[PDB]
From a paper:
The bacterial flagellar motor is a huge bidirectional rotary nanomachine that drives rotation of the flagellum for bacterial motility. The cytoplasmic C ring of the flagellar motor functions as the switch complex for the rotational direction switching from counterclockwise to clockwise. The basal body is made up of the LP ring, MS ring, C ring, rod and export apparatus. Here, we present two high-resolution cryo-electron microscopy structures of the C ring-containing flagellar basal body–hook complex from Salmonella Typhimurium, which are in the default counterclockwise state and in a constitutively active CheY mutant-induced clockwise state, respectively.
To obtain the C ring-containing basal body–hook complex in the CW state, we constructed the constitutively active double mutant D13K/Y106W of CheY (hereafter referred to as CheY**), which can mimic CheY-P to tightly bind to the C ring and lock the rotational direction of the motor in the CW state. The density maps of the LP ring, MS ring, rod, hook, and export apparatus in the CW state were locally reconstructed to the higher resolutions ranging from 2.8 Å to 3.8 Å. The MS ring is located on the inner membrane, houses the export apparatus and forms the assembly base for the C ring. In the intact C ring-containing basal body–hook complexes, the MS ring is more stable and harbors much more clear densities for the outer RBM1 subring, outer RBM2 subring and putative inner RBM1 subring, which are made up of 11 RBM1, 11 RBM2 and 23 RBM1 domains of FliF, respectively. In the intact C ring-containing basal body–hook complexes, there is one more peptide loop L3, which consists of the residues G310–P322 of FliF and is also extended from the β-collar region of the MS ring, bound in a hydrophobic groove that is formed by the α2–α3 linking loop of FliE6 with the D0 and DC domains of FlgC1 and FlgC6 on the surface of the rod. The interaction manner of L3 with the rod is different from those of L1 and L2 loops with the rod in the structure of the C ring-free flagellar motor. Thus, there are totally 11 FliF loops that extend from the MS ring to bind the rod in the basal body for torque transmission. These 11 loops are possibly derived from the FliF subunits in the 11-fold outer RBM1–RBM2 subrings. The more stable MS ring in the C ring-containing basal body–hook complexes indicates that the C ring is also important for the stability of the MS ring during motor assembly. Although the structures of the LP ring, MS ring, rod, hook, and export apparatus in the CW state are highly similar to those of these components in the CCW state, the protomers of the C ring in the CW state notably undergo inclination and compaction, suggesting that the binding of CheY** induces significant conformational changes of the C ring for rotational switching.
Residue numbers in the entry:
A (entry chain D): 1 to 89
B (entry chain U): 3 to 54, 62 to 78, 83 to 136
C (entry chain Q): 3 to 136
D (entry chain P): 3 to 21, 32 to 104
E (entry chain O): 3 to 21, 31 to 104
F (entry chain K): 3 to 21, 65 to 104
G (entry chain E): 4 to 256
H (entry chain J): 37 to 245
The structure:
Amino acid sequence: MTPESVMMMGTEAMKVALALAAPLLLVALITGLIISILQAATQINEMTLSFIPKIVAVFIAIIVAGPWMLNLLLDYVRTLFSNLPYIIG
Amino acid sequence: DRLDAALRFQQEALNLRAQRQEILAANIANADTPGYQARDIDFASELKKVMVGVALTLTSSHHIPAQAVVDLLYRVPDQPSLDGNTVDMDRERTQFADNSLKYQMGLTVLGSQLKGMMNVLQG
Amino acid sequence: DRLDAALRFQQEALNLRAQRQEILAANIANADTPGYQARDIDFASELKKVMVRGREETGGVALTLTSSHHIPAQAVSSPAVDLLYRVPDQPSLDGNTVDMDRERTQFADNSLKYQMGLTVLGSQLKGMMNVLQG
Amino acid sequence: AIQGIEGVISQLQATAMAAVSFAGQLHAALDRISDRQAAARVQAEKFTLGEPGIALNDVMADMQKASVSMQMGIQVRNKLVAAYQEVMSMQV
Amino acid sequence: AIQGIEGVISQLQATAMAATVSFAGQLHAALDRISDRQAAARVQAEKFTLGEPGIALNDVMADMQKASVSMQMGIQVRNKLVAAYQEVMSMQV
Amino acid sequence: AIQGIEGVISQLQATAMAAGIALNDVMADMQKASVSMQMGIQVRNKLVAAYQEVMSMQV
Amino acid sequence: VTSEQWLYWLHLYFWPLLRVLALISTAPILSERAIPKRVKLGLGIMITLVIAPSLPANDTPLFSIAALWLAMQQILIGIALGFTMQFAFAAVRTAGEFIGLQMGLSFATFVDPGSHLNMPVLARIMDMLAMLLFLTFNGHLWLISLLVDTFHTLPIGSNPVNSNAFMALARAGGLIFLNGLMLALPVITLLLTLNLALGLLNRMAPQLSIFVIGFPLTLTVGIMLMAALMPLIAPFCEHLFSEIFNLLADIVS
Amino acid sequence: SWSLSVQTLVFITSLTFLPAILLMMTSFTRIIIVFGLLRNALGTPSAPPNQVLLGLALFLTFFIMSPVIDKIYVDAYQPFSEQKISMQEALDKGAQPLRAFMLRQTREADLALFARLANSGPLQGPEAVPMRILLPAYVTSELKTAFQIGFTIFIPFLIIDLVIASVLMALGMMMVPPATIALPFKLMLFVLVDGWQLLMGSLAQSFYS
Amino acid sequence: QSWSLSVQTLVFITSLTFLPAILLMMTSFTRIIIVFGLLRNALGTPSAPPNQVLLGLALFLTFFIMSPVIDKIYVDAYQPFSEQKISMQEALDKGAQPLRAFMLRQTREADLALFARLANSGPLQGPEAVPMRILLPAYVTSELKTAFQIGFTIFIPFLIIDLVIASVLMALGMMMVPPATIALPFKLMLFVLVDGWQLLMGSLAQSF
Amino acid sequence: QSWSLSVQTLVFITSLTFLPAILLMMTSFTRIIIVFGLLRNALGTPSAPPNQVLLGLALFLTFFIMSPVIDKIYVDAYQPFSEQKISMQEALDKGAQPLRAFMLRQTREADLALFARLANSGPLQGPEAVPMRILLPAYVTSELKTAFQIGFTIFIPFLIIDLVIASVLMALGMMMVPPATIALPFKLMLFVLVDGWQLLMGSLAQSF
Amino acid sequence: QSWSLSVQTLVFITSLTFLPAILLMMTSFTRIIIVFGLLRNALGTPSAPPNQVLLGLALFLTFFIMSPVIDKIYVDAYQPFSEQKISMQEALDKGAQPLRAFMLRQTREADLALFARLANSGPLQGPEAVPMRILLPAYVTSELKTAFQIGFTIFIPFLIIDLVIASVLMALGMMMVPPATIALPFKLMLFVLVDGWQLLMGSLAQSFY
Amino acid sequence: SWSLSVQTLVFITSLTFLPAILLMMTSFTRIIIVFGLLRNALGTPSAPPNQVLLGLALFLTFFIMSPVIDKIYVDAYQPFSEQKISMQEALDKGAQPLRAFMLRQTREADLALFARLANSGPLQGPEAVPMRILLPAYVTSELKTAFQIGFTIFIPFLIIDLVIASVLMALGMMMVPPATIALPFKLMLFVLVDGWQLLMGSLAQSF
């Protein structure tokens, strides 16, 4: 009820969002950086060949860590809906 | 029912007026019977008695429900007849006309009450 | 203001009809009282008078009730209309001028004119709800 | 209640320091109409009872007045309900 | 029924242990009240037409009018309930 | 009121520069009030509809 | 007897109802479409029932241009109060949308302005957070109290009016921008530095950077930055509400 | 007591205000606001059709207001129907359990504000609060509680859209709408975590707590 | 014992007011209409088939699905009531049985358990002890959940097409094109080459 | 057997109530309306022709297409009824046949089989005896499928134009130039030059 | 032969409902608003002037365009109606002829031929004998085609500006600069200096002649 | 003076056209278009909500109509009570200030075009322009004025965007999009100079 509880609500929610999005974004960033440094080493420059492995890497990311995200988000939503009638004002 | 309690008094008055009307007409019809006593009822006391029962209990469907199933005062004679008939024409004719008038008044009052209860509902 | 002014003529005419019928009923009630001159009012002149200057009453004063336990009481009250005498038709020994034919003709005429006023006022008020309704 | 009497004395102290409504009016009108109707009904029952002094003229006139008052109350209720329905139909 | 007697003994056990409003039940009770009033008036008229002694015409008419008043009560309550339900269900969330 | 008499003299200066209850009454005022209330409701509804049409715009 | 003067009651209960309902239809949270219309109308009716008997009743007829002027006055007061309150949520929405746009969340607006493709999801997040905070600080009760209080300052009866006062509300349009800049500032600046850092990477071997490495890094950095910045809005939320409230108090009079 | 005609007239007139009682004195407002907000959240403004949600809200309100209705029936309707309590006293007797139910769920701040706006004297205990103060205080408290519940409801459905947009933006697909992708995932979430049982139980507890 | 004919007429004509409510809450109309709306959202165009066509088609589908229940009601309740062999109340009680079975067969256990918890129900026992006022909201909740389960998996192929087209377009280089604009004709092609309408009706019917 | 006059006018007014449903689910209005909406979406102009203009065009096209069926109904069914030659029941039965034939001409056998198998209808010999309750949903489904086919086919030339302009812009290095702004005027030019409106209406009429 | 007063009132009030349909399918309005719907797209601001402003401007322009037709209808048909020298049927027959001529002069022959063939009409001797059922949809079709022609032609100078600005931006190596935002103010410049609105309305009015 | 019921009908009917009066007769279109163009300038098409822009334009319109409202009050509101002039002579008398304002804000070319569109040859004087010719001409003039003001607003933001892109290109960066960098600088320039208050002051001066 108190504004401290509200702002905590937003923080924990958006940290959950950060945890959900961090693996995919970080995998894409690492793949892009690796392809870019390889291009710099080989002196190859086409703006389209960096887009190819990124999709494959990010799609594999759901294969490997997808169940973890799905279990984390469901637990968050379940706990939020269960604690809903105790943060009422 | 509350509807009965509102209309109980006028219904009982109307029924008592009809019964006394029948008694007075019986007195008129038997005017010539030698030895006939003129009978009548005291309207107010009987109206008190009626205004002031246990349906037997029905356990199932086959069980049969309970089956349902006034005091006459002699008129004081005025003139002594030889055949023992105490019916006086004038007295009972006036009483008959009065009872007819009061029956009409009771009908009017009961109809007015029902019509008011109706216009309360109409809409 | 505008709506009050537009509906004021028929409303005042209907009130004057009511008062005239009260007077006529008083004449009919006193029809057998010895020494009672029949009273009546000039409808048109009194209607214009009430039109120009608002309705007024002879007295109509009353005890003031500041508290909630004061006993309410009002003294006699009557309109500011001029009660004129009707010209008798034929003489009578008791001394009243209430001729029953005149009384019952004026009663029926006032009845129909009051119903006419009700009809006109109701028509105007519907003629207005028709506009407002939407 | 003991606490209720405490509250009464508190409101009396409030009055000391300091030194009806539409629903009330409607309740008063309903009570007046019901009282008139009950008076007419009681007089009618008394006349039907045979008690002396009650005239049929007064009974019939009082029943007439009670009917007129009931009809007035019905009309007031009808309009009031119509006005409430009109107000509740307003779009906000 | 055998299962019916089982249910009777079960309700007896319920009474032993013991030693809930219903709007549908209330509506059923009110409809019953109206229907038995109408049926009683109808049967009284039946007997009075058949010529059975003890029935009076004024009582017949009064009971018929009472049944009419009861049915008008029911009709008005129906109108109010249906209007309220329709206005509630015509609302948008 | 003292201020009321001030207002009276002000209106005079303005002129200088310029140079029991029956059913009959109960029902009539009852109807007049119903009519005025309906008029107010309709005018407010028109104003609210115009305002919502203005605010439902797209800029 | 049996008077029940209807015009007096109507004139006593109408104009306060007009002002209360005008505030209701525009005041934040009380004007959200999720509330059924009948609930709003009933709240206005009950508030007027509580308030009106204490006020002096007006006698101007409903069938006059004076009634129209009165109705216009009540509508103006109500919408002014509600809108001045709404300005704070407008500012919060602006700050959130700008943080989100510096996230690169909706890049299609820079190439197709207003092309039916825009999602200010951060703006919505902080808008609903601001609504929750406003509910917590009981701002709506205050709004209702001030709606009542503006009578003593400005009675129902037609009163003369001023001018630059309207400008003030219009000039409040600056606050939406001015306060929005500060909220952002605590994050956009660092994001700016991040973009500057990306520029340093592009000053190396040409191409092979930006649109491939900049977007995910800046998205994650914006996310965690403003996730850490979330505790900061509440003091700024109270500051915004106080600014709107005392501006309203000063200018309405 | 009143005449039977007056009692029938009052009963028929009072039957009119049933929607007002349901909306302003009952648990209906919070549930309907929460349902509308949730429907706004999932991105399907016409999904459970208004009639389905209205019927569910009516059944929920009937299940929630059961003890209050029972107390009214046992204390007011039963004596009135048995000609023990007059018609003008059954209303007063039955208005007390509803008043108590409205009080418990209301809030001090609203009560203080509406006690100040009426210029009423000090209210030392809750037993001195009239209905003219409790009604709008209860209404405002219910509105605020419903909006709080809905606004904490809204957060996950916006979180999903945020992460969807960020993931789409990582790969450079800047011209893909995020709402169209997020809607199936929001439906999947609301299916997985017992979307309705948890919400139903949370609302019911929110009343009984 | 039987109701009077006036009472029967009053009840019969009053009950017709709940016909839309019965059709929506108690029958299969809700699930079909929700699935159709979700499919319209999933097609990429929000109002391609007018609401009227979808509503009529959903009504016909609901009638065809519920025809066995209607036949059972007619055999059990309507026919013996119209021949004046049973009373109105007993006819309604008898006719509520097949509809109760239909509602139970598609009811989630958790929904029924929760709504029995909220109604203070204690020793329930046989599946034939659930009252109508408890069974109905549980059926509605289960129908909403099932409709959402169907919709979110109806969404899948169109998301696949959208993602494939966007990925191909951006990887090829044309990143300034709107992928949805090019994708919509392909969504229509997929829907017409699979016989999406016929298969969707088959799946909706076989869901019961 | 002939209905009394009051029953006849009751039936007539009740049938007049169902007019939009008949127009949408029994005539060619739905297919034309769907194709028009898809075409409007295809030009990149979501609100250029107002909905009322397209609705009026679809209504007139439907009237022209259904003129032979209406003429058959008038000559075979309505005219004898208006001259009191035949009753209302047999007139309606005779008027059903031409409309039924028209709807059967434009339905797909697979959808008819689906709805027959779903409704548990017994084997039906030939097209002569197929209930309207079976034919109407099948015809609606076939109309939906055909409309989607036509719209998807129509979507092709604008897709060609968009792709060619996007490629021309991209091969010039213009990386941040959106192709919609350049494509919309050329889409309008293409639709104008081929006499698009009359050609598309003629194609829709010829398909019926 | 004249209709009764009740039938005349019924027909008049019934025909009053077709006012938007008549305005769209029989007057100039369809060509105007559609062009506006495209012009706001050419300027790069879909918001543009608000929708209601454009609609009312189109309405005023339509009234000015149909002033001669309205005057001819008022003189030939409605004036005898008011002065009692004609019936309602004859007035309806006579007043439509100037409007039919106005519709025919802007009707392409190909569309008219298409709708004849589609109605299986017999050999029409001359324009004067063309049925309204054939003239209405053909007029609407030709109207749409003409509006699209005008809109595409309007789309030209803004395309010129966009192409020039994009070429200038790319020739300087400023490849990452979106040219839409830069070219929008120059489109506004072009519409202001040339007096785009007045010129466009004059062109539309002259086009109808 | 005609019937009261007809007066009520006419009044409620004229109440419907209130958005038309606000848009076509007052200046509301000008402020709303200026706000839309300014929002398009900063690069954020949803930063202030459409509701807030509409309300700000409404308040600006109310102030800038306050002199005309005062003239209406003097010529129509007051004498309608003293009944020196009423009904006809007054509604037109009260509308006269609107005519003067719209003549002031209307260009001659639009009026000339709309006159030759109505074959009104003998329109010689400039205070007897009919409403049918005055209204659409005034709307077109308002559109032109709003577009000019929008371009003037556009100039500094376009300059800032161009400068940011030029410095990015000169510094060696060829891939960094200049919009992301230039957006916060656009905002800090807009706030620091206090763009909003000067914009409203100029709009009020723009009449």
